[PDB]
Symmetry: C3
């Protein structure tokens, strides 16, 4: 179980990376060609934010595709791992923007949003330190650490944002809850795949692992986007409470 070695360099996962790259690209331009003539100031804002997501994911995927986005991490026993660090560079900007989109739709104050980006980014960096960790003690401490943060993100997402989004139209609250649910479950798959992936225990090959992340990423990016830029809630209405 691996895929295809598309660059004659012993990395059959490049098949999933390539497809991943291709999919983020068409999304970036689907969204761009889709909002190109949108005059609504609220929506064009959602479009801009959402277009950059697959946009930056595309660079990370292309990077990993070529091999530039991956690095060899020697463990404490001399055992080498191929860590695709670029994912974190990706996530450092993508996840915050995704949150941003949820925060705009919910009409939350700048403090909540700031808390959101800060805790989320703390999560990504610490997740990256875990990835480059040489000792298992450290690799797992960072995991729980990054996870505590994610726990905080989900919390404020499932309370502050949700209740704030309930003060708006049913059309709006509807769309918010059907991205927050998507977020909740889709995002959660990430830490699991990591601790069971090659960065953790390792009962899942890098191939399947690279396949999972592609599916998870595309769906969290493009799938989220399609749904979001397709709703009517983004068309007008500027609330304020919570």
């Amino acid at each position: 179980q691996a895929g295809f070695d598309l660059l004659n360099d012993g990395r059959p996962e490049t098949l999933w990376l390539g497809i991943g790259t291709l999919l983020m690209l068409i999304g970036t331009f689907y969204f761009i060609a889709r909002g190109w003539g949108v005059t609504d100031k609220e929506a064009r804002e959602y479009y801009a934010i959402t277009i950059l997501v697959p946009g930056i994911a595309s660079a990370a995927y292309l990077a990993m595709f070529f091999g530039i986005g991956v690095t060899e991490v020697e463990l404490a026993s001399g055992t080498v791992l191929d860590i695709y660090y670029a994912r974190y560079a990706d996530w450092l900007f993508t996840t915050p923007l995704l949150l941003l989109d949820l925060a705009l739709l919910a009409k939350v104050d700048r403090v909540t949003i700031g808390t959101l980006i800060g805790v989320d980014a703390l999560m990504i960096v610490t997740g990256l330190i875990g990835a480059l960790s040489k000792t298992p003690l450290a690799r797992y401490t960072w995991w729980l650490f990054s996870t505590i943060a994610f726990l905080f993100v989900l919390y404020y997402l499932l309370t502050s944002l949700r209740s704030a989004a309930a003060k708006r139209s049913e059309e709006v609250r509807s769309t918010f809850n059907t991205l927050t649910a998507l977020v909740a479950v889709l995002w959660t798959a990430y830490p699991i795949l990591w601790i069971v992936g090659t960065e953790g225990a390792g009962v899942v090959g890098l191939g399947i692992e690279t396949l999972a992340f592609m599916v998870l990423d595309v769906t969290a990016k493009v799938g989220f986007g399609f749904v979001l830029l397709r709703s009517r809630a983004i068309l007008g209405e500027t609330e304020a409470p919570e």
Copy 2:
């Protein structure tokens, strides 16, 4: 004079790093458990900002603790130094937020704040380049360079912010001046400890040096926090001038 070699890897300073890590953690949660039910929108904002500080310091300390946050820098004479670079990753986000807190309490315009973060970050990066410098000529040029910037930060802090904070309540001006004084002296210790530390001349071992930074950092983070989140000035009142 060193401390304790807590990880059997020849780094007795890990004793100070560990304690440093532990102290930033309890602070992060002290503040979190302390503002958890704060409805005041002004204060919850100060809380959020201030909670992230020990929060990010904790990741840097844990990083250095494990050894991941330190790197060997070969000098021009083949002489190796153990540079704890992670401190700068820390400071790149912590010092700006600390400034932010002072800027909110003072009610300064967005231009002043922008100038503040920009010059301060310039200071940290240049300080980091100095740390990784191989030649002493370069290591000291960067020091003065980073110091010129810090000089600008202290300046606008002791004039623009101070006078702007004097237009507010005595309770507010009081708290502002008792953090700005703390800032002024505590922050200043940093460049001194550096030029006299292992990154500069070196009349102070990495142990004592790592001890000093821990004391300085905890007091600048948690000490600042305690004092700030404990004042009444953060509870309400939204001015505007200067």
Copy 3:
């Protein structure tokens, strides 16, 4: 054709780097000494933004000057290249601020500006990945990629910003168009010099190349600055449309 080997380390381009460093410094302080007593809140804002540009360029130039800002990139054939990566660290903050200045003068909404920084930064990073690429296939893919983004930047600059700047005074529109033209042509020289520089085909030595970038950078930084901080358009007037 090279210049002068100012540090006895086989890098005659340090002559252009040094001059580049020196020129960014006097600019940083020319601007600082020039706006030191400016009370106009609009202009002081332009000044602050514009002062940081040569300011950060100075750190990058000094970095490259010492050699710290350059790294050896082994190509797929074992052929080594001296990549001055620091330029991108430079550009990651400088180009966005330059755009910022154009966006303020034009009075564009926060969405346009956000789109601007995001696409521009995507351009710089991807340009940096191209620089560190080992294969030519990859080095050129990244070039087109970074170029597509730049294409988007020029687009929204020559339409959204321009038309938005035409709603203001003739004095304002005048200055906007005489920086946007400068931007348009000066910025465009960059990708060309790259693909023809040592990072691409290579029909231009690193000396001339390092000379060109210095001329291009100084003129885009200090030249832009002089012109901008010298206009009357920055003195007052706060519009709003587009």
